[PDB]
From Swiss-Prot:
Pfam families: ALGX (PF16822), CBM_26 (PF16824). Belongs to the AlgX family. Keywords: Acyltransferase, Alginate biosynthesis, Disulfide bond, Periplasm, Signal, Transferase. The gene is algX. Monomer. Interacts with AlgK and MucD. GO terms for cellular component: periplasmic space. It comes from Pseudomonas aeruginosa (strain ATCC 15692 / DSM 22644 / CIP 104116 / JCM 14847 / LMG 12228 / 1C / PRS 101 / PAO1). Its main location: periplasm. It is found in: Periplasm. Consists of two domains, with an N-terminal domain with structural homology to members of the SGNH (GDSL) hydrolase superfamily and a C-terminal carbohydrate-binding module (CBM) that may bind alginate. Residues 1-304 are annotated as: SGNH hydrolase-like domain. Its EC number is 2.3.1.-. Changing residue 133 to A: Produces a non-acetylated alginate. Loss of in vitro acetylesterase activity. This is Alginate biosynthesis protein AlgX.
Length: 419
């Protein structure tokens, strides 16, 4: 039913289109993406695995256990919706093997990791995935949350977490015209039916003993993508099957990084850290991205908050370059053991362009893009570079390139010792 042009990866050469490379027509109105859905490669580089373990450890030091929800591919779960040709062409066993190996590597990094493989190659009346979209249906989210809940119960400390009874009810229908279907419409002029599935919500029921473990506060937090959003009720099913409150901090559009970064920038996170942090994302993200970890690591301990700065200053941004902090007294500030903490006056500024000068004339240009949908109060936090040959350098200056900058916009920067 798809037009011939749809079969060529080079036809998907744009921003919108690159998320669909390339579309194939399966049974009924099922579409699959070859590179996203029918992939056989999973995981990350050795550096990625080291960064994941380091982050897990930092979290563990703070009394936080990490659970990763590694959402499986549409190909692994809904294999059977493929055409016989496509099914024959999709190396399902290789994909499954590589996926499971990746799950094992998560575990080896000290991360609790639910195994979704019993859901693979499913035969279910309510399909795990939408026909022409990248989101799971609520039923998919539900079957996933049952397994995750089983992992949560194994997590050290889970027994002390306050327990409640939750019930999930269907409260309406959820309409979705899938993104793959829309992409195919743009490419081929095709037209696909909007899907309507069961929409669910979850509520506490019963009496208001076990409710008061850990003083009664919620102890489990969820960070994630649009998949953990309210429409699919992933958090609600987690509560239903686990008996525990789930603080949902998912960010739609946030991808791999945004939700967790915004959450760990929040004050409540550092005031009352969760015993358990659940982290949900899919298989196409680059898990080794260094600028992610440079923020996440120092964010575990609230950057410079509560702790004395060696330098601190507030300047109004001019168009272009702004020198923000200058070590004019030539104080001892070793890079690979120092941290930056920075706050815009306008919380709607979702981009930060930094230049870091050292006493040897070298420079680092660090550019941090933040999701449009989050609000960290305009705050950003990052470690000074500690690559092989940078950790040793003496800090000289921090400069900030102005953002469509709001008028009057100022910025507050501070540099502190790291623990």
């Amino acid at each position: 039913n798809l037009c011939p042009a749809a079969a060529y990866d080079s036809r998907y050469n744009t921003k919108y289109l690159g998320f669909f490379t390339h579309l194939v027509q399966a049974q009924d109105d099922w579409l699959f993406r070859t590179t996203y859905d029918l992939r056989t490669d999973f995981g990350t580089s050795a550096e990625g695995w080291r960064e994941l373990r380091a982050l897990r450890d930092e979290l563990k030091r703070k009394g936080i256990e990490l659970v990763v929800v590694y959402q499986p591919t549409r190909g692994l779960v809904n294999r059977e919706k493929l055409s016989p040709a496509e099914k024959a062409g999709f190396d399902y066993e290789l994909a499954k093997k590589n996926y499971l190996a990746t799950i094992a590597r998560f575990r080896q990094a000290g991360i609790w990791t639910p195994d979704f493989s019993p859901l693979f190659d499913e035969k279910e009346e309510h399909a795990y995935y939408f026909k022409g979209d990248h989101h799971w249906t609520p039923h998919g989210a539900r079957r996933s949350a049952k397994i995750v809940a089983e992992t949560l119960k194994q997590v050290p400390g889970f027994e002390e977490i306050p327990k409640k009874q939750f019930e999930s009810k269907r409260v309406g229908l959820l309409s979705k015209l899938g993104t793959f279907h829309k992409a195919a419409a743009q490419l081929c002029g095709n037209s696909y039916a909007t899907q309507y599935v069961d929409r669910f919500e979850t509520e506490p029921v019963g009496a208001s003993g076990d409710l008061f473990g850990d003083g009664g506060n919620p102890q489990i937090a969820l960070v994630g993508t649009s998949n953990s959003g309210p429409a699919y009720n992933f958090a609600g099913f987690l509560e239903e099957f686990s008996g525990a409150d789930i603080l949902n901090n998912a960010v739609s559009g946030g991808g791999f990084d945004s939700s967790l970064l915004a959450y760990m920038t929040s004050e409540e996170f550092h005031k009352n850290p969760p015993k358990i942090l659940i982290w949900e994302f899919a298989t196409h993200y680059d898990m080794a991205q260094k600028s992610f970890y440079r923020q996440a690591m120092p964010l575990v301990d609230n950057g410079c908050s509560g702790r004395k700065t060696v330098l601190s200053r507030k300047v109004k941004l001019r168009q272009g370059r702004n020198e923000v902090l200058l070590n004019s007294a030539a104080l001892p500030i070793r890079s690979g053991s120092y941290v930056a903490d920075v706050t815009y006056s306008d919380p709607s500024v979702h981009e930060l362009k930094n230049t870091i000068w050292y006493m040897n004339g070298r420079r680092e240009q660090l550019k941090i893009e933040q999701s449009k949908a989050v609000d960290t109060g305009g705050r950003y936090v990052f470690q000074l570079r500690n690559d092989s040959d940078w950790a040793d350098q003496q800090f000289l200056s921090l400069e900030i390139e102005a953002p469509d900058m709001p008028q009057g916009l100022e910025v507050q920067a501070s540099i502190c010792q790291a623990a």
